[PDB]
Symmetry: C2
Subunit: 108 residues, 2 copies
């Protein structure tokens, strides 16, 4: 169970923030739908033991290698979105596209 934060949050630890990706703003007319979607992002500190899915992470923290800046804050749960778009073969394609939305953030 991860943390969710608004932009004004005082939370420094690894957290999921809201963010809309706007294909229309990008100028991507090859995408028919959706024109924009809630993608979110991860940001925040990953101190000892915090929000770690894998047992690996804390073992490496204790082994304490010199060349490591420690774990960092990335997505731990992802979800797809459905898209309708033009391809480069003169067709309109419908697809469920995996790995488009961040649902949770954690440290590894």
């Amino acid at each position: 169970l991860g943390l969710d934060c608004d932009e004004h949050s005082s939370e420094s630890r690894c957290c999921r923030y809201p963010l809309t990706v706007d294909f229309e703003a990008f100028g991507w007319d090859w995408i028919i739908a959706p024109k924009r979607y809630k993608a979110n992002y991860c940001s925040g500190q990953c101190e000892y033991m915090f929000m770690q899915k894998y047992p690996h992470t804390h073992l490496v923290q204790q082994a304490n290698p010199r060349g490591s800046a420690g774990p960092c804050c990335t997505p731990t749960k992802m979800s797809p979105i459905n898209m309708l778009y033009f391809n480069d073969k003169q067709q309109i394609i419908y697809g469920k596209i995996p790995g488009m939305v961040v649902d949770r953030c954690g440290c590894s």
Copy 2:
């Protein structure tokens, strides 16, 4: 397909480095076997488009939110190891433990 680096590598981009976790050095006598194992770690920069498993990552990079320090370098492939250990119920347990070894590093 990720990058593998030795400690003296001049590679600045997200890369997997070798690292041994030594349970004996930790003093963890509750672990019978293995006494140590090759765990590895990830470290390196995650610039635009580099080593990204999910389409999400580059879309957020282009959306360019202020509160984001961009994607970072974490494990993208993990593997288990088998362990024999004492529990806290006066038993010796054998188990295949997931998420113990980093096999590949990437940016998200």
